[PDB]
Design a protein around this nucleic acid. Structure first.
Lengths: 183, 180
DNA sequence: TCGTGTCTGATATTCGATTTAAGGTACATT
DNA sequence: AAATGTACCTTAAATCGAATATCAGACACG
């Protein structure tokens, strides 16, 4: 019944020390904590993979701090559950053990195979070149592209369209470049 | 307590008929089944018809949304209406006992992948908090005026009407400067 | 001197979960 | 009836870094 913990960041040392301090207050010994930072340097996680034994429990601050994605996360959770090793996520109040633990691993296994079949879908038609994150980032497009394309198609010069729609001349070329690359 | 079901494919009509046949073997009426193909119109019609207490039968999880994020978004949207979803093959239900547990965990899964994208952002925010950078809204209210008037014995309602602020705002300001 | 392409850097948003400020309601009290 | 405190809940800005759009010129060439 050994207690372990894991913490992962990209760069920041402070937010890493935040997790470590949380694990230490959770009753995890200092030597029982493994960490990583960004090549794929997982050595802290790999060392945890080695040391863990049946009956051992691994404490993690949040779900996002485990895998590099949803797939990797469940892949890891399954890996520890196979060995009887339980994972408890502190802030989210979730565990792979106790009572609901099996239900936890069950639904986690469902979405895993579900998205794996979704990967099998995308792979056939093709997606990955696109790489959809799902969150909308950046300034919204306020410019009507259709008007720009139509005018230029009629032979209207670059500076004439820019003066027409009150955009920059460079903006016109960016629009023409984006739609040309699209075609 | 009406029974509904959903089936989704990309191209193949055969795999669609498989789901439909499976839904009908589960005791769903023929007019209670909605389908879509690569056009969410069938799913949108389902969103409209459903009411609190109704349950939806789906063959598998992957047959719901276009990705994991969309799926959880849908399930949350139905759970918000009290509508439940039971996946046949995966053996998972959003009602009864496990119901809260399903929504709770799927919420954590979704919020985790978003926080994964925000990793470098919210870490830089933690270093910013460390530097002492002030978060939250900036104070537009002069604290001196509020505290000076109150020192002379001006009532709370009067200061509020004076500076055109809220009454509870004055108390909160007095509380902050007293506690420190 | 002027218009056209190609290019880089500077502004401008917009995101999500969190964090403080302010507005607002509700209840009990004086 | 009116003003006074006290207790939480909604809006309302404001945060980081990354991502997307637009602006503003520079530079070379005919």
């Amino acid at each position: 019944m050994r207690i372990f913990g894991y913490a992962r960041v990209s760069t920041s040392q402070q937010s890493l020390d935040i997790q470590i301090r949380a694990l230490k207050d959770a009753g995890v010994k200092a030597n029982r904590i493994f960490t990583d930072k960004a090549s794929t340097d997982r050595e802290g996680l790999d060392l945890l993979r080695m040391k863990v034994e049946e009956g051992d429990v691994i404490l993690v601050k949040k779900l996002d701090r485990l895998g590099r994605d949803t797939a990797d996360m469940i892949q890891l959770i399954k890996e520890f559950d196979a060995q009887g090793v339980a994972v408890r996520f502190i802030d989210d109040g979730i565990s792979t053990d106790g009572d609901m633990g099996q239900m936890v691993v069950t639904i986690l296994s469902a979405v895993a195979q579900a998205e794996r079949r979704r990967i099998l879908e995308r792979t056939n038609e093709g997606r990955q070149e696109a790489k959809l994150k799902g969150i909308k980032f950046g300034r919204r497009r306020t410019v009507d592209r259709n008007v720009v394309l139509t005018l230029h198609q009629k032979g209207t010069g670059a500076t004439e369209i820019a003066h027409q729609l009150s955009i920059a001349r460079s903006t016109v070329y960016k629009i023409l470049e984006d739609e040309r690359a699209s075609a």
